[PDB]
Amino acid sequence: TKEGVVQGVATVAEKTKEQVTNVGGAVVTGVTAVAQKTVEGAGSIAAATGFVKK
Amino acid sequence: TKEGVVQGVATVAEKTKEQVTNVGGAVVTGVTAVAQKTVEGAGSIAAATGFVKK
Amino acid sequence: TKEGVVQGVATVAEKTKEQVTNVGGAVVTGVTAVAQKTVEGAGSIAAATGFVKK
Amino acid sequence: TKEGVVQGVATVAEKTKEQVTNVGGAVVTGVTAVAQKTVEGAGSIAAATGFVKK
Amino acid sequence: TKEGVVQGVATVAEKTKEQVTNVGGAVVTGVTAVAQKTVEGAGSIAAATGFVKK
Amino acid sequence: GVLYVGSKTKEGVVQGVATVAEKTKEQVTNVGGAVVTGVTAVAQKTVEGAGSIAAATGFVKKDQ
Amino acid sequence: GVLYVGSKTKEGVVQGVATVAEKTKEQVTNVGGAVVTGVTAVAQKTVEGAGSIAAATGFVKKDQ
Amino acid sequence: GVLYVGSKTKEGVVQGVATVAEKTKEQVTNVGGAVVTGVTAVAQKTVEGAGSIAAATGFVKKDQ
Amino acid sequence: GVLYVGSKTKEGVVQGVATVAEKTKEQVTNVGGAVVTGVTAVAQKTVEGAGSIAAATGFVKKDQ
Amino acid sequence: GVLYVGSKTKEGVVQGVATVAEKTKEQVTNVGGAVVTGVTAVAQKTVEGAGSIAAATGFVKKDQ
Numbered sequence: 001t002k003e004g005v006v007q008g009v010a011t012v013a014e015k016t017k018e019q020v021t022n023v024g025g026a027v028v029t030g031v032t033a034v035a036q037k038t039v040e041g042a043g044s045i046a047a048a049t050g051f052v053k054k
Numbered sequence: 055t056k057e058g059v060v061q062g063v064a065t066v067a068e069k070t071k072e073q074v075t076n077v078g079g080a081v082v083t084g085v086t087a088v089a090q091k092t093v094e095g096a097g098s099i100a101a102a103t104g105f106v107k108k
Numbered sequence: 109t110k111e112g113v114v115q116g117v118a119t120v121a122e123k124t125k126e127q128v129t130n131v132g133g134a135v136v137t138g139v140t141a142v143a144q145k146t147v148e149g150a151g152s153i154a155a156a157t158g159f160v161k162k
Numbered sequence: 163t164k165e166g167v168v169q170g171v172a173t174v175a176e177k178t179k180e181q182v183t184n185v186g187g188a189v190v191t192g193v194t195a196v197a198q199k200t201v202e203g204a205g206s207i208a209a210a211t212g213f214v215k216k
Numbered sequence: 217t218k219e220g221v222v223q224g225v226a227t228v229a230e231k232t233k234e235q236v237t238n239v240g241g242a243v244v245t246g247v248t249a250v251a252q253k254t255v256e257g258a259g260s261i262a263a264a265t266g267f268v269k270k
Numbered sequence: 271g272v273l274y275v276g277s278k279t280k281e282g283v284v285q286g287v288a289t290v291a292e293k294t295k296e297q298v299t300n301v302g303g304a305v306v307t308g309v310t311a312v313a314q315k316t317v318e319g320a321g322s323i324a325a326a327t328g329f330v331k332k333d334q
Numbered sequence: 335g336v337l338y339v340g341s342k343t344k345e346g347v348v349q350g351v352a353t354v355a356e357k358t359k360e361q362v363t364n365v366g367g368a369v370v371t372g373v374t375a376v377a378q379k380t381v382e383g384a385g386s387i388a389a390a391t392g393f394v395k396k397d398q
Numbered sequence: 399g400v401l402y403v404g405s406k407t408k409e410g411v412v413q414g415v416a417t418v419a420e421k422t423k424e425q426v427t428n429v430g431g432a433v434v435t436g437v438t439a440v441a442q443k444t445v446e447g448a449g450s451i452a453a454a455t456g457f458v459k460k461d462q
Numbered sequence: 463g464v465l466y467v468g469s470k471t472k473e474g475v476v477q478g479v480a481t482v483a484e485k486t487k488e489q490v491t492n493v494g495g496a497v498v499t500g501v502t503a504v505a506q507k508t509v510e511g512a513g514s515i516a517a518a519t520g521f522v523k524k525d526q
Numbered sequence: 527g528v529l530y531v532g533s534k535t536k537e538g539v540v541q542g543v544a545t546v547a548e549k550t551k552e553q554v555t556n557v558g559g560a561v562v563t564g565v566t567a568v569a570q571k572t573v574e575g576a577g578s579i580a581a582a583t584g585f586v587k588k589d590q
Contacts, residue, residue, distance in 0.1 A: 018123060160214045183238075298361075309353050337401045443508060457518060
């Protein structure tokens with residue numbers, strides 16, 4: 001009995017010479033796990049990864 | 055009995071010399087897992103990856 | 109019986125020479141796990157990773 | 163019986179020569195685990211990692 | 217019976233020559249675990265890691 | 271008999287060798303063998319001898 | 335008989351070797367063998383002898 | 399008989415060797431073998447002898 | 463018989479060796495073997511002898 | 527018989543060796559073997575002898 005769940009995330013990453021340049025923005029290069037059961041509300045935002053709001 | 059669930063994410067990545075340049079935006083090059091059961095609401099946003107809102 | 113849960117996140121990362129330059133923004137290159145059962149509210153924001161709000 | 167829980171986060175990272183330069187922003191390159199059961203409120207923000215609000 | 221709990225965080229990190237330069241901002245490169253059951257309030261902020269508010 | 275009068279002679283010489291090598295993730299797995307990845311200069315006037323071997327790079331011999 | 339009168343001779347010489355090597359993650363796994371990744375200069379006037387070996391780099395011999 | 403009158407001779411010489419090596423995470427695993435990653439200069443006038451070996455770098459011999 | 467009259471001779475010489483090595487996380491694991499990572503200069507006029515070995519770097523011999 | 531009249535001779539010499547090594551986390555694990563990471567200069571006029579060995583760096587012999 002499982003609801004709103006991330007069970008298993010397995011990542012093997014062997015990068016080499018990685019570089020990231022970001023001006024006034026949002027950059028993600030990793031591992032992100034978000035588990036949420038219930039979110040409610042007007043104009044509401046849930047589970048935003050790399051999100052730019054102007 | 056499983057609802058709103060990400061069970062297994064397996065990634066093997068052997069990058070080499072990766073570079074990312076982003077100005078005022080959103081860039082994702084990783085692993086993102088989002089599990090949500092119930093989201094409700096007007097103008098609501100759920101599970102946005104690489105999302106630019108102006 | 110599991111709800112609103114991240115069970116197992118396993119990451120092996122062997123980077124070498126990684127550099128990150130960010131001006132006035134948000135950058136994430138790691139491992140982020142967020143588990144939330146219930147979030148409620150107008151204009152509310154829950155589980156934002158790499159989020160720029162102007 | 164588990165709700166609002168992060169069970170197991172396992173990370174092996176063997177970086178070498180990593181450098182991070184950030185001016186007036188937010189940068190995260192580590193391991194962040196946030197578990198919350200219930201958060202409620204207008205204009206409320208919960209679980210923000212790498213979040214810039216202007 | 218577990219609610220609002222981070223059980224086990226295990227990290228092995230073998231960095232070498234890491235340097236971080238930050239001007240007027242927020243930078244985190246470590247291990248952060250936050251567990252909260254109930255947070256309530258308008259304009260309230262809970263579990264912010266790398267958060268810049270202007 | 272060798273007579274040099276007012277002469278200039280270069281005999282058995284490597285004069286100028288210039289090499290630039292840029293790599294990233296160079297990896298070598300070798301079992302019971304010979305792998306050469308370097309820079310090698312060998313200069314010899316006289317090598318004399320039956321069955322002799324001079325200037326071998328990356329050389330495997332299992333003579334039986 | 336060797337007679338040099340007012341001569342200039344370079345015999346068995348390596349003059350100038352210049353190398354630049356830039357790597358990142360160089361790794362070598364070697365079992366019962368020979369791996370050479372360096373810079374090697376060998377200069378010899380005279381090597382004399384039956385079955386002799388001069389200037390071997392990365393050399394495996396299992397003569398039986 | 400060797401006669402040098404007013405001569406300049408370079409015999410068996412390595413003159414100038416210049417090397418720049420920039421690495422990051424160089425790792426070597428070697429079992430029962432020979433691995434050379436360095437800089438080596440060998441200069442010899444005369445090597446004489448049956449079955450002799452002169453100037454070996456990264457050399458494995460299991461002669462039987 | 464060797465006669466040098468007013469001569470300049472360089473015999474068996476390594477003149478100038480310049481090396482710059484920049485590393486970070488250099489690690490070496492070696493079992494029953496020979497690993498050389500350094501800088502080596504060997505200069506010899508005369509080496510004489512049957513079965514002789516001169517100027518070996520990273521040398522493994524298990525002669526039987 | 528050797529006669530030098532008014533001569534200048536360099537025989538068996540290493541003149542100038544300059545090395546700069548910058549490391550961070552250098553670690554070496556060695557079992558029953560030979561690992562050389564240093565700077566070595568060997569200069570010899572004459573080495574004479576059957577089965578002789580001169581100028582060995584990182585040398586393992588288990589002759590049987």
